[PDB]
mmCIF file of all heavy atoms in Angstrom:
data_model
loop_
_atom_site.group_PDB
_atom_site.id
_atom_site.type_symbol
_atom_site.label_atom_id
_atom_site.label_comp_id
_atom_site.label_asym_id
_atom_site.label_seq_id
_atom_site.Cartn_x
_atom_site.Cartn_y
_atom_site.Cartn_z
ATOM 1 N N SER A 128 98.421 42.422 62.591
ATOM 2 C CA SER A 128 96.995 42.129 62.648
ATOM 3 C C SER A 128 96.375 42.675 61.344
ATOM 4 O O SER A 128 97.109 43.157 60.464
ATOM 5 C CB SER A 128 96.394 42.837 63.886
ATOM 6 O OG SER A 128 96.524 44.244 63.749
ATOM 7 N N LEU A 129 95.044 42.666 61.251
ATOM 8 C CA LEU A 129 94.321 43.402 60.186
ATOM 9 C C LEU A 129 94.672 44.868 60.052
ATOM 10 O O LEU A 129 94.309 45.462 59.062
ATOM 11 C CB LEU A 129 92.783 43.339 60.372
ATOM 12 C CG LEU A 129 92.095 41.969 60.492
ATOM 13 C CD1 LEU A 129 90.590 41.981 60.197
ATOM 14 C CD2 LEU A 129 92.760 41.015 59.530
ATOM 15 N N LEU A 130 95.368 45.479 61.009
ATOM 16 C CA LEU A 130 95.806 46.861 60.822
ATOM 17 C C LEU A 130 96.778 47.037 59.710
ATOM 18 O O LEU A 130 96.858 48.135 59.164
ATOM 19 C CB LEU A 130 96.496 47.434 62.089
ATOM 20 C CG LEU A 130 95.656 47.925 63.224
ATOM 21 C CD1 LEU A 130 96.572 48.399 64.349
ATOM 22 C CD2 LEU A 130 94.645 48.992 62.776
ATOM 23 N N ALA A 131 97.561 46.021 59.374
ATOM 24 C CA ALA A 131 98.597 46.202 58.364
ATOM 25 C C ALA A 131 98.008 46.378 56.944
ATOM 26 O O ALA A 131 98.632 46.989 56.109
ATOM 27 C CB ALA A 131 99.577 45.056 58.402
ATOM 28 N N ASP A 132 96.764 45.954 56.758
ATOM 29 C CA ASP A 132 96.113 45.797 55.432
ATOM 30 C C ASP A 132 95.557 47.043 54.763
ATOM 31 O O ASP A 132 95.171 46.967 53.589
ATOM 32 C CB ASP A 132 94.917 44.821 55.526
ATOM 33 C CG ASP A 132 95.315 43.448 56.038
ATOM 34 O OD1 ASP A 132 96.152 43.327 56.965
ATOM 35 O OD2 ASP A 132 94.762 42.468 55.519
ATOM 36 N N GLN A 133 95.425 48.139 55.514
ATOM 37 C CA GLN A 133 94.952 49.412 54.956
ATOM 38 C C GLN A 133 95.406 50.535 55.840
ATOM 39 O O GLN A 133 95.818 50.312 56.935
ATOM 40 C CB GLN A 133 93.415 49.488 54.716
ATOM 41 C CG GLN A 133 92.528 49.840 55.914
ATOM 42 C CD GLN A 133 92.659 48.784 56.976
ATOM 43 O OE1 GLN A 133 91.974 47.768 56.926
ATOM 44 N NE2 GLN A 133 93.612 48.967 57.887
ATOM 45 N N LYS A 134 95.309 51.719 55.261
ATOM 46 C CA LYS A 134 95.712 52.966 55.809
ATOM 47 C C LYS A 134 94.653 53.425 56.826
ATOM 48 O O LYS A 134 93.465 53.266 56.563
ATOM 49 C CB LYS A 134 95.815 53.960 54.627
ATOM 50 C CG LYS A 134 96.003 55.396 54.991
ATOM 51 C CD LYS A 134 95.978 56.256 53.751
ATOM 52 C CE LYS A 134 96.484 57.660 54.052
ATOM 53 N NZ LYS A 134 97.909 57.696 54.507
ATOM 54 N N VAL A 135 95.127 54.058 57.903
ATOM 55 C CA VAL A 135 94.311 54.784 58.914
ATOM 56 C C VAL A 135 94.474 56.278 58.866
ATOM 57 O O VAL A 135 95.591 56.782 59.013
ATOM 58 C CB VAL A 135 94.725 54.299 60.338
ATOM 59 C CG1 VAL A 135 94.113 55.191 61.439
ATOM 60 C CG2 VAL A 135 94.408 52.840 60.489
ATOM 61 N N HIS A 136 93.387 57.004 58.699
ATOM 62 C CA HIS A 136 93.375 58.454 58.585
ATOM 63 C C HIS A 136 93.304 59.162 59.913
ATOM 64 O O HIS A 136 93.929 60.222 60.049
ATOM 65 C CB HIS A 136 92.188 58.932 57.735
ATOM 66 C CG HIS A 136 92.158 58.328 56.356
ATOM 67 N ND1 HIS A 136 91.636 57.077 56.085
ATOM 68 C CD2 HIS A 136 92.633 58.786 55.175
ATOM 69 C CE1 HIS A 136 91.804 56.783 54.812
ATOM 70 N NE2 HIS A 136 92.384 57.817 54.227
ATOM 71 N N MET A 137 92.465 58.683 60.856
ATOM 72 C CA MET A 137 92.365 59.294 62.212
ATOM 73 C C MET A 137 92.597 58.199 63.297
ATOM 74 O O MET A 137 92.048 57.061 63.181
ATOM 75 C CB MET A 137 90.995 59.967 62.495
ATOM 76 C CG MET A 137 90.450 60.890 61.398
ATOM 77 S SD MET A 137 88.902 61.662 61.834
ATOM 78 C CE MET A 137 89.516 62.871 62.998
ATOM 79 N N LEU A 138 93.404 58.559 64.300
ATOM 80 C CA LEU A 138 93.740 57.713 65.471
ATOM 81 C C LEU A 138 93.286 58.384 66.803
ATOM 82 O O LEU A 138 93.828 59.432 67.140
ATOM 83 C CB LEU A 138 95.220 57.519 65.520
ATOM 84 C CG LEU A 138 95.832 56.660 66.662
ATOM 85 C CD1 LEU A 138 95.282 55.189 66.641
ATOM 86 C CD2 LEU A 138 97.361 56.667 66.690
ATOM 87 N N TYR A 139 92.377 57.739 67.526
ATOM 88 C CA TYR A 139 91.948 58.207 68.823
ATOM 89 C C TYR A 139 92.783 57.405 69.802
ATOM 90 O O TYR A 139 92.618 56.180 69.915
ATOM 91 C CB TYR A 139 90.493 57.933 69.045
ATOM 92 C CG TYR A 139 89.506 58.829 68.272
ATOM 93 C CD1 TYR A 139 89.424 58.741 66.900
ATOM 94 C CD2 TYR A 139 88.663 59.742 68.930
ATOM 95 C CE1 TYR A 139 88.510 59.518 66.165
ATOM 96 C CE2 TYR A 139 87.733 60.524 68.212
ATOM 97 C CZ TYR A 139 87.675 60.420 66.834
ATOM 98 O OH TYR A 139 86.784 61.187 66.060
ATOM 99 N N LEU A 140 93.780 58.073 70.377
ATOM 100 C CA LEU A 140 94.968 57.444 71.037
ATOM 101 C C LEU A 140 94.924 57.512 72.583
ATOM 102 O O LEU A 140 94.762 58.641 73.210
ATOM 103 C CB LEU A 140 96.249 58.118 70.477
ATOM 104 C CG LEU A 140 97.604 57.624 71.018
ATOM 105 C CD1 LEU A 140 97.871 56.147 70.629
ATOM 106 C CD2 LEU A 140 98.704 58.558 70.534
ATOM 107 N N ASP A 141 95.063 56.353 73.221
ATOM 108 C CA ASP A 141 95.373 56.240 74.642
ATOM 109 C C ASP A 141 96.771 56.782 74.973
ATOM 110 O O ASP A 141 97.833 56.132 74.769
ATOM 111 C CB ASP A 141 95.187 54.812 75.171
ATOM 112 C CG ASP A 141 95.785 54.595 76.591
ATOM 113 O OD1 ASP A 141 95.908 55.605 77.376
ATOM 114 O OD2 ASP A 141 96.040 53.399 76.951
ATOM 115 N N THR A 142 96.740 58.036 75.473
ATOM 116 C CA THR A 142 97.936 58.822 75.827
ATOM 117 C C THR A 142 98.249 58.897 77.328
ATOM 118 O O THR A 142 98.932 59.861 77.777
ATOM 119 C CB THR A 142 97.766 60.266 75.286
ATOM 120 O OG1 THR A 142 96.439 60.769 75.608
ATOM 121 C CG2 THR A 142 97.852 60.271 73.784
ATOM 122 N N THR A 143 97.819 57.878 78.095
ATOM 123 C CA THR A 143 98.040 57.825 79.524
ATOM 124 C C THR A 143 99.495 58.237 79.935
ATOM 125 O O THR A 143 99.690 59.142 80.770
ATOM 126 C CB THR A 143 97.636 56.433 80.084
ATOM 127 O OG1 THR A 143 96.237 56.177 79.886
ATOM 128 C CG2 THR A 143 97.944 56.319 81.575
ATOM 129 N N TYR A 144 100.497 57.591 79.308
ATOM 130 C CA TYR A 144 101.900 57.796 79.636
ATOM 131 C C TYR A 144 102.711 58.446 78.518
ATOM 132 O O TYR A 144 103.866 58.081 78.275
ATOM 133 C CB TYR A 144 102.494 56.488 80.078
ATOM 134 C CG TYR A 144 101.900 55.939 81.348
ATOM 135 C CD1 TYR A 144 101.410 54.642 81.391
ATOM 136 C CD2 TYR A 144 101.864 56.682 82.512
ATOM 137 C CE1 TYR A 144 100.894 54.093 82.560
ATOM 138 C CE2 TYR A 144 101.343 56.175 83.694
ATOM 139 C CZ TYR A 144 100.850 54.890 83.712
ATOM 140 O OH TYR A 144 100.320 54.394 84.835
ATOM 141 N N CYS A 145 102.087 59.406 77.803
ATOM 142 C CA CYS A 145 102.693 60.152 76.710
ATOM 143 C C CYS A 145 103.667 61.284 77.143
ATOM 144 O O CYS A 145 103.371 62.468 76.983
ATOM 145 C CB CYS A 145 101.634 60.744 75.766
ATOM 146 S SG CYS A 145 102.320 61.453 74.251
ATOM 147 N N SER A 146 104.739 60.869 77.834
ATOM 148 C CA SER A 146 105.874 61.683 78.201
ATOM 149 C C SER A 146 107.123 60.796 78.401
ATOM 150 O O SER A 146 107.032 59.677 78.940
ATOM 151 C CB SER A 146 105.557 62.491 79.481
ATOM 152 O OG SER A 146 106.479 63.563 79.560
ATOM 153 N N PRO A 147 108.292 61.262 77.958
ATOM 154 C CA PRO A 147 109.461 60.376 77.938
ATOM 155 C C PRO A 147 109.989 59.879 79.271
ATOM 156 O O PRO A 147 110.715 58.879 79.298
ATOM 157 C CB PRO A 147 110.557 61.192 77.192
ATOM 158 C CG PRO A 147 109.936 62.497 76.790
ATOM 159 C CD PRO A 147 108.515 62.565 77.274
ATOM 160 N N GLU A 148 109.617 60.479 80.388
ATOM 161 C CA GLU A 148 109.964 59.890 81.699
ATOM 162 C C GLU A 148 109.301 58.550 82.012
ATOM 163 O O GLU A 148 109.696 57.879 82.944
ATOM 164 C CB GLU A 148 109.684 60.838 82.869
ATOM 165 C CG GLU A 148 108.228 61.155 83.226
ATOM 166 C CD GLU A 148 107.649 62.330 82.456
ATOM 167 O OE1 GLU A 148 108.021 62.603 81.261
ATOM 168 O OE2 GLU A 148 106.764 62.984 83.047
ATOM 169 N N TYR A 149 108.249 58.208 81.280
ATOM 170 C CA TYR A 149 107.521 56.960 81.523
ATOM 171 C C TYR A 149 108.193 55.814 80.741
ATOM 172 O O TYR A 149 107.877 55.519 79.589
ATOM 173 C CB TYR A 149 106.045 57.123 81.187
ATOM 174 C CG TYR A 149 105.310 58.131 82.060
ATOM 175 C CD1 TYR A 149 104.998 59.360 81.602
ATOM 176 C CD2 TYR A 149 104.988 57.812 83.412
ATOM 177 C CE1 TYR A 149 104.370 60.299 82.433
ATOM 178 C CE2 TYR A 149 104.328 58.741 84.249
ATOM 179 C CZ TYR A 149 104.033 59.987 83.754
ATOM 180 O OH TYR A 149 103.401 60.938 84.568
ATOM 181 N N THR A 150 109.123 55.144 81.428
ATOM 182 C CA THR A 150 109.731 53.901 80.969
ATOM 183 C C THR A 150 109.288 52.848 81.949
ATOM 184 O O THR A 150 109.140 53.110 83.178
ATOM 185 C CB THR A 150 111.273 53.917 81.047
ATOM 186 O OG1 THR A 150 111.682 54.262 82.391
ATOM 187 C CG2 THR A 150 111.839 54.933 80.062
ATOM 188 N N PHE A 151 109.092 51.639 81.440
ATOM 189 C CA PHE A 151 108.959 50.533 82.383
ATOM 190 C C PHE A 151 109.368 49.211 81.755
ATOM 191 O O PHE A 151 109.477 49.099 80.548
ATOM 192 C CB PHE A 151 107.611 50.540 83.183
ATOM 193 C CG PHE A 151 106.434 51.197 82.469
ATOM 194 C CD1 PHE A 151 105.921 50.550 81.411
ATOM 195 C CD2 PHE A 151 105.833 52.392 82.909
ATOM 196 C CE1 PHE A 151 104.854 51.078 80.738
ATOM 197 C CE2 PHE A 151 104.718 52.943 82.211
ATOM 198 C CZ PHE A 151 104.262 52.261 81.129
ATOM 199 N N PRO A 152 109.634 48.216 82.597
ATOM 200 C CA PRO A 152 110.063 46.922 82.053
ATOM 201 C C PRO A 152 108.928 46.155 81.368
ATOM 202 O O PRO A 152 107.777 46.549 81.423
ATOM 203 C CB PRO A 152 110.509 46.132 83.329
ATOM 204 C CG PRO A 152 110.039 46.920 84.471
ATOM 205 C CD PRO A 152 109.326 48.137 84.017
ATOM 206 N N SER A 153 109.273 45.090 80.638
ATOM 207 C CA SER A 153 108.237 44.238 80.097
ATOM 208 C C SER A 153 107.459 43.589 81.213
ATOM 209 O O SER A 153 107.976 43.347 82.334
ATOM 210 C CB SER A 153 108.850 43.129 79.174
ATOM 211 O OG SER A 153 109.662 42.246 79.975
ATOM 212 N N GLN A 154 106.278 43.148 80.859
ATOM 213 C CA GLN A 154 105.455 42.376 81.733
ATOM 214 C C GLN A 154 106.148 41.045 82.133
ATOM 215 O O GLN A 154 106.103 40.682 83.299
ATOM 216 C CB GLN A 154 104.068 42.125 81.135
ATOM 217 C CG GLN A 154 103.169 43.375 80.962
ATOM 218 C CD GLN A 154 101.826 43.133 80.270
ATOM 219 O OE1 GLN A 154 100.906 43.953 80.350
ATOM 220 N NE2 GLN A 154 101.701 41.987 79.664
ATOM 221 N N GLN A 155 106.830 40.416 81.165
ATOM 222 C CA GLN A 155 107.573 39.188 81.413
ATOM 223 C C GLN A 155 108.611 39.390 82.533
ATOM 224 O O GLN A 155 108.672 38.615 83.437
ATOM 225 C CB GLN A 155 108.293 38.678 80.146
ATOM 226 C CG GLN A 155 108.829 37.255 80.297
ATOM 227 C CD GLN A 155 110.250 37.199 80.875
ATOM 228 O OE1 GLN A 155 111.095 38.059 80.563
ATOM 229 N NE2 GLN A 155 110.531 36.174 81.707
ATOM 230 N N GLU A 156 109.429 40.424 82.436
ATOM 231 C CA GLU A 156 110.476 40.691 83.463
ATOM 232 C C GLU A 156 109.916 40.950 84.839
ATOM 233 O O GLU A 156 110.506 40.507 85.863
ATOM 234 C CB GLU A 156 111.334 41.935 83.094
ATOM 235 C CG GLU A 156 112.239 41.945 81.870
ATOM 236 C CD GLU A 156 112.823 43.378 81.612
ATOM 237 O OE1 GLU A 156 113.727 43.698 82.424
ATOM 238 O OE2 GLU A 156 112.412 44.193 80.650
ATOM 239 N N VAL A 157 108.789 41.674 84.903
ATOM 240 C CA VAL A 157 108.124 41.938 86.165
ATOM 241 C C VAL A 157 107.549 40.636 86.765
ATOM 242 O O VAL A 157 107.728 40.392 87.943
ATOM 243 C CB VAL A 157 106.987 43.026 86.099
ATOM 244 C CG1 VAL A 157 106.191 43.125 87.408
ATOM 245 C CG2 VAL A 157 107.571 44.392 85.735
ATOM 246 N N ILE A 158 106.913 39.793 85.968
ATOM 247 C CA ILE A 158 106.399 38.506 86.541
ATOM 248 C C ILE A 158 107.565 37.611 87.007
ATOM 249 O O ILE A 158 107.484 36.902 88.030
ATOM 250 C CB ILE A 158 105.552 37.786 85.474
ATOM 251 C CG1 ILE A 158 104.306 38.610 85.215
ATOM 252 C CG2 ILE A 158 105.215 36.356 85.880
ATOM 253 C CD1 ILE A 158 103.465 38.881 86.442
ATOM 254 N N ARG A 159 108.660 37.626 86.258
ATOM 255 C CA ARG A 159 109.871 36.880 86.681
ATOM 256 C C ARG A 159 110.364 37.305 88.077
ATOM 257 O O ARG A 159 110.599 36.451 88.997
ATOM 258 C CB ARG A 159 110.970 37.047 85.635
ATOM 259 C CG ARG A 159 112.273 36.340 85.954
ATOM 260 C CD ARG A 159 112.386 34.977 85.299
ATOM 261 N NE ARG A 159 111.391 34.004 85.815
ATOM 262 C CZ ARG A 159 111.633 32.720 86.109
ATOM 263 N NH1 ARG A 159 112.859 32.184 85.991
ATOM 264 N NH2 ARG A 159 110.633 31.968 86.567
ATOM 265 N N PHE A 160 110.405 38.610 88.302
ATOM 266 C CA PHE A 160 110.758 39.160 89.593
ATOM 267 C C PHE A 160 109.798 38.672 90.675
ATOM 268 O O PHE A 160 110.226 38.219 91.745
ATOM 269 C CB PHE A 160 110.824 40.684 89.585
ATOM 270 C CG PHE A 160 111.035 41.273 90.917
ATOM 271 C CD1 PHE A 160 112.313 41.334 91.456
ATOM 272 C CD2 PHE A 160 109.971 41.726 91.679
ATOM 273 C CE1 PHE A 160 112.530 41.851 92.721
ATOM 274 C CE2 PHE A 160 110.167 42.220 92.933
ATOM 275 C CZ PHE A 160 111.471 42.303 93.457
ATOM 276 N N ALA A 161 108.499 38.734 90.395
ATOM 277 C CA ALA A 161 107.491 38.401 91.415
ATOM 278 C C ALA A 161 107.501 36.906 91.753
ATOM 279 O O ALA A 161 107.401 36.549 92.938
ATOM 280 C CB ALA A 161 106.089 38.825 90.992
ATOM 281 N N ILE A 162 107.611 36.044 90.737
ATOM 282 C CA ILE A 162 107.691 34.595 90.983
ATOM 283 C C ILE A 162 108.898 34.186 91.833
ATOM 284 O O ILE A 162 108.761 33.439 92.791
ATOM 285 C CB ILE A 162 107.786 33.854 89.634
ATOM 286 C CG1 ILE A 162 106.416 33.854 88.967
ATOM 287 C CG2 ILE A 162 108.348 32.451 89.768
ATOM 288 C CD1 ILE A 162 106.584 33.443 87.500
#
């Protein structure tokens, strides 16, 4: 996106699942299961 075009100095980050136990499948794989 436009992010690639310049440097970022500060990041205010969504850290909801910022621990290595939080793995999950892609959204595609989960919808495949549900369908």
Side-chain angles (χ1 to χ4, degrees):
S128 63
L129 305 200
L130 280 179
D132 302 40
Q133 83 298 275
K134 170 184 193 63
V135 169
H136 303 83
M137 313 182 75
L138 180 60
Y139 286 67
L140 180 65
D141 168 25
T142 46
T143 298
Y144 296 127
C145 189
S146 199
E148 69 272 32
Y149 296 104
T150 54
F151 28 70
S153 65
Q154 293 176 163
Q155 192 271 323
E156 294 172 74
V157 172
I158 293 303
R159 179 96 294 222
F160 174 81
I162 285 166

